Structure 1
Amino acid sequence: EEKEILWNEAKAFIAACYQELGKAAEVKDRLADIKSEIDLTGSYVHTKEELEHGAKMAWRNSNRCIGRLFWNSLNVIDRRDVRTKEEVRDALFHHIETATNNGKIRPTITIFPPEEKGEKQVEIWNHQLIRYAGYESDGERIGDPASCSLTAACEELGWRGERTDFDLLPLIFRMKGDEQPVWYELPRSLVIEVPITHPDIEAFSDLELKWYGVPIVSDMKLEVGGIHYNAAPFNGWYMGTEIGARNLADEKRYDKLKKVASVIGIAADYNTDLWKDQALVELNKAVLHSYKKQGVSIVDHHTAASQFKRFEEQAEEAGRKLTGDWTWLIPPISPAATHIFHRSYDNSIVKPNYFYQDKPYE
């Protein structure tokens, strides 16, 4: 039953994975041994090669991701050997260091032991390994509102933030058998941040905006051939609009457009002046400029869409069906300036893939 669905997903994955690796012949025996290990044990164990390719396929199949051209060069770190919270912490620290790579970001995933009985071995509470805390009480809003619930959970466990607008949340995760998670403060030497300045407008620094270099999503489940890696943080580099058109711009996030309008010297009084649009463009130019100036990888939405067009072309040429989520693939500024806006995408779910899972806080 469980064994059944596990077997089925395993067959589909192993077949596909071995064709892609040019190892079509080895399938039958590999499949045989898997059916055996399943019947005996209730599960099976991926080889390094299978796991690495599975993680790459999962990225390739992520409908909402514009950055998929580079799927085959994902750096996969196999940490299925960790057993202790010190080891998990150190693995997370290491992921940050190697992914950051002095600013020349390496798309990386660290893979922890998978769910056994549906029982998690390691459960990471962070949404991203590096993210800012958020506070809300007494009309007072500080930091990132998206982080309010996790921040509150951390402070329930004895952590205390400085209540700056950019407090780094601690790493926070729970081990199987432990009733509570543990938290560890981030060593600042590991975390690159970028001050936001503008190429022409000197006053832009008065806003004292910054953002972190490397987004490392740590709360999604990687599913490969029926195996559920609920703990498998991965990172790429940012597309500039994620920071400039959302994280810093949304009313429910840092909500900076009025302040941007003021420093760039335009009125924020009339919808018809398109001051929000103008503020968005200057804020987004500033973000790209700032990351490039500091030597931290980033991509603008036009270049990213051009890369994605090549991904589409490669899928076709390889005989692979393309799947995508138009509503997430279009960038949140000038979307009609990209080819993406002007076609449609099949939003079907293909596995291996990355999936949402319920937050253990909230």
Structure 2
Amino acid sequence: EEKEILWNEAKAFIAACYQELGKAAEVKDRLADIKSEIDLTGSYVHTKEELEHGAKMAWRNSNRCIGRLFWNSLNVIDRRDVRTKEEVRDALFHHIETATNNGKIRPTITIFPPEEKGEKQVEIWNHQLIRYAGYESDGERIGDPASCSLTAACEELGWRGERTDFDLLPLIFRMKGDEQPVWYELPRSLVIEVPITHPDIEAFSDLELKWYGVPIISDMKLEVGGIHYNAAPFNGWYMGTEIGARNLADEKRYDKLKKVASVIGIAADYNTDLWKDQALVELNKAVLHSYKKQGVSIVDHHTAASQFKRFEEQAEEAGRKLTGDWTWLIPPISPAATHIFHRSYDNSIVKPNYFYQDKPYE
């Protein structure tokens, strides 16, 4: 059965892939080779072209992603050759470096060897390669509450955070055959961080907010043609609302709105004052300004939505069905100011795609 699942996915993927690549005539022979390879080995190996295009298609099919206009320019790094934890580590360091690109962020994915018989070769524990630790000890909250469980697992492994609000978690991953993951501290020179200041309100720096430049999702599974790349960290640049309206603002995250309201000189007493909404806007203005001032790529949600509209037009002009998850595509601030809010999207799952997988901790 597992072989038949593999085969059907391969057929569907190869056909679609080669069609887009203009290699339609090569489908027949490639399918035979894959058929034979599955029969003998229980699997098959993607050519570099298939893999690159697979990762790009997967991005293009990510319903929840507003950034998909640029799917075709994804930088795909093929690291299916890694066998050792130092190679994995170095590949992750390299991804961070080349993705960051001195602030001019390059959407990049590094692809590690795929699961074999559902056996992972590399198991990355990080939710993002760059993320802040979180602690909760007797009422005491420090750092990012979303990182609490991973932070606790890291500290089980002999790592110790300094317990600032912005401790960088180490990279943590397990190799096939090892009982325990290994962790490596991130070199600070690799990690770009942006102090959050406001263009007009000087007191805003009193909050001592910052965030990291590059969101690098490292815990999803890339599936291409029935091959499961469980370890395939990818990054884009941030849309400002992800930082200003969620990471810094959410009550279950950094929860900064009351402090924001205080530094911008408004009372945080009455719902009817819309102080949260007002704080959200200034915080979000601060984030965009701060990233721009530092030369770190970021997009505001209006521009992102305009770009997504072009993705929709591009999809239709290419005769491709467009899929989307309205609930994630709308920005968490002023969603009704975007066109996204005023239409519907088919939330069908098309493959290749990125998928959630179970956490190895917790």
Q: Is this a same-fold pair by TM over 0.5?
A: yes
* Deviation of 1:210 (Å): 0.2
Q: Deviations over 1:189-208 (max 9, x none)?
A: 00000000000000000000
* Deviation of 1:41 (Å): 1.1
Mapped to 2, the partners of 1:155 and 1:40 lie a distance apart of 44
Q: Deviations over 1:4-55 (max 9, x none)?
A: 0100000000000000000100001111111111111110000000000000
Question: What secondary structure does 1:135 align onto?
Answer: strand
Q: Deviations over 1:289-329 (max 9, x none)?
A: 00000000000000000000000000000000000000000
Question: What secondary structure does 1:76 align onto?
Answer: strand
* Deviation of 1:151 (Å): 0.2
Mapped to 2, the partners of 1:3 and 1:131 lie a distance apart of 37
Q: Deviations over 1:59-110 (max 9, x none)?
A: 0000000000000000000000000000000000000000000000000000
Structure 2 residue 39 is matched with structure 1 residue 39: yes
Question: What secondary structure does 2:56 align onto?
Answer: helix
Mapped to 2, the partners of 1:37 and 1:129 lie a distance apart of 34
Mapped to 2, the partners of 1:120 and 1:199 lie a distance apart of 47
Unaligned runs of 5+ in 1: none
1:281 corresponds to which residue? 281
Mapped to 2, the partners of 1:40 and 1:333 lie a distance apart of 53
* Deviation of 1:247 (Å): 0.3
Question: What secondary structure does 2:296 align onto?
Answer: coil
Mapped to 2, the partners of 1:120 and 1:234 lie a distance apart of 18
* Deviation of 1:144 (Å): 0.2
Mapped to 1, the partners of 2:274 and 2:50 lie a distance apart of 51
Mapped to 2, the partners of 1:86 and 1:283 lie a distance apart of 39
* Deviation of 1:350 (Å): 0.2
* Deviation of 1:126 (Å): 0.2
Question: What secondary structure does 2:307 align onto?
Answer: helix
Question: What secondary structure does 2:80 align onto?
Answer: coil
Mapped to 2, the partners of 1:337 and 1:230 lie a distance apart of 37
* Deviation of 1:136 (Å): 0.2
Q: TM-score, normalised by structure 2?
A: 1.00
Alignment of 1:1-362 (within 5 A): 1-362=1-362
Mapped to 1, the partners of 2:189 and 2:50 lie a distance apart of 34
Unaligned runs of 5+ in 2: none
Mapped to 2, the partners of 1:264 and 1:51 lie a distance apart of 49
Mapped to 2, the partners of 1:31 and 1:280 lie a distance apart of 53
Mapped to 2, the partners of 1:355 and 1:130 lie a distance apart of 20
* Deviation of 1:237 (Å): 0.1
* Deviation of 1:240 (Å): 0.1
Mapped to 2, the partners of 1:65 and 1:172 lie a distance apart of 26
Alignment: residue pair count: 362
* Deviation of 1:2 (Å): 1.1
